[PDB]
Every structure is written in structure tokens, then in C-alpha cells.
Amino acid sequence: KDFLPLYFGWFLTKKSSETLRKAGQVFLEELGNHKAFKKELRHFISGDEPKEKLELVSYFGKRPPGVLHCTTKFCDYGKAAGAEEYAQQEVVKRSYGKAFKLSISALFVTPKTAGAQVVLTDQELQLWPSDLDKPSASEGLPPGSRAHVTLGCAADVQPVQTGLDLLDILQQVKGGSQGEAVGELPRGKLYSLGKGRWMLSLTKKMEVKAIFTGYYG
């Protein structure tokens, strides 16, 4: 019998990866230099500390090397629950190797991860794994809300954290707790959601090109 991928997803082209990666780093630069962020650094550095500034690019030291991606289904070669069902779908097999455009609507930062929120079209939503055997997965939010691109992680943080972070952030925006924007960056508005959580809503959605395929490690 045949190995499944470690995970399925959309893998950005060289150019799109470069473009999104640069946007993420610029965001980390501006955020770290933003007065509202520094006023709340108690959520990134603990204890009575010298009043210095944190370089977020350095903070998120575990970064994706090379090509960026948006995961759909983690399969672990077929060991993960629902892995085979997902892989056997017609739409997954039909879409394998095909090009897509992913709309990135926001960039976010928590004390654990940094990433970009992806807003899937309905065609692309067809490639999002069914939560019907684990509605814990998407936590009351529309399907595919977890869709993201990871831009960086803190040293002690597991890779899957980014998706959980995004859902947490979106969960607040659902209850209307993003509050009044606390800053206006060149690319959009900065929101302070508390607990070291920050969201930049892009004025203009970023459009990235990516191939849907499988990663085998």
C-alpha cells in the first residue's frame, strides 16, 4: 500500500513566497517599533526588565525555510485520523498539482507565532478537510477559518500553534472584541486584541500563487 504525504496543502511559488515573506518581516519591523506594542511588551518579556526594545524578527527565530505553504490536511503518511478519507476524495485527487490563488487578508502576531490569515474561496474550501468527526477543530467558526501561512514561531513553540493562534484571534473578532484600532500602518490597521495578540487587517488583500500538492518530509 502507498504512503500518503506528511500533509497536503498549497505551496506558494518562489515569487509569492518571497513577496509574502517580505511583507511578514516588514510587519514585524513596524510592529516592534510601534508605540502601542512597546507599551504592552509585558506579554513578550517577563519580569522587571531593562526598558529595551524587542526585535520580533529575532523573537520568531524558527522560520519556514524557503517555500511557504498553507496546510489543508495533516496526514502523517496516513497515520492521522481522517487522512485516508481526505486523500481519497475526488476533489483532492483532481486538484493535485493544480495552481490556485490564495487571498491573504491579515497578518498576525502572538507571543507564540506569527503568520498570515488566508481566506479560501469556495472552490478552495472544497479542499479543506471535513470537521464532521471533530467539530472541536474549527471551534464554532466557519470551515477553513484556520487556513493560514506560518511566518515564524518562538523557540519553544510547536508548528501547529499558528493555526490555533489564528482561530483564537478570529474567535475574538467574532464576539466583537478586536476593539477600536490602535494604529494605522502603511498596509492596513493595527488591532490590539490583548494577551500579546496583534492583528493587521490589510487594506488590500494580498494575492499569492500556489500549487496544491503533497509534502513528504
Ligand X SMILES: Nc1nc2c(ncn2[C@@H]2O[C@H](COP(=O)(O)OP(=O)(O)O)[C@@H](O)[C@H]2O)c(=O)[nH]1
Q: 71: annotated binding-site residue?
A: yes
Single out the catalytic residue among 69, 73, 146, 187: 69
Bridge partners (DSSP) of residue 189 are 184, 201
Interatomic CA distance for residues 202 and 5, integer angstroms: 33
Distance CA 57, CA 200 (A): 16
* Closer Cβ to ligand X, 19 or 162, answer by number: 162
Residue 150 in contact with ligand X, rule: CB under 6 A: yes
| 74 versus 191: smaller Cβ distance to ligand X | 74
Q: Does the footprint of ligand X cover residue 66 (CB under 6 A)?
A: no
Query: Cα–Cα distance between 46 and 12 in angstroms, integer?
Result: 36
- Strand ranges, E, within 49-196: 69-74, 99-109, 113-119, 148-153, 183-185, 188-194
Residue 192 touching ligand X (CB under 6 A) = no
Of residues 5, 152, 163, 214, which one binds ligand X by CB under 6 A?
163
Q: Look at the chain and count its residues.
A: 217
At closest approach, how far in Å is the CB of 204 from ligand X?
Answer: 24
Is 148 a known active-site residue?
A: yes
Which string of b and e fits 183-195 if b means at least 16 CB within 10 Å? Answer: bebebbbbbbbee
Grid coordinates given for 22:
517580505
Instruction: Establish if 144 lies at the interface with ligand X (CB under 6 A).
Output: no
Distance CA 212, CA 111 (A): 30
Using the rule CB under 6 A, is 214 a contact of ligand X? no
Q: Which candidate in 112, 148, 187, 197 is catalytic?
A: 148
Site string for ligand X, 79-98 (x = CB under 6 A): -x------------------
List the interface residues with ligand X, window 7-26 (CB under 6 A): 7
Interface residue list for ligand X (CB under 6 A): 7, 71, 74, 80, 150, 159-160, 162-163
Q: List the binding residues.
A: 71, 150
Q: List the binding residues for substrate.
A: 71, 150
Q: Which residues are catalytic?
A: 69, 148
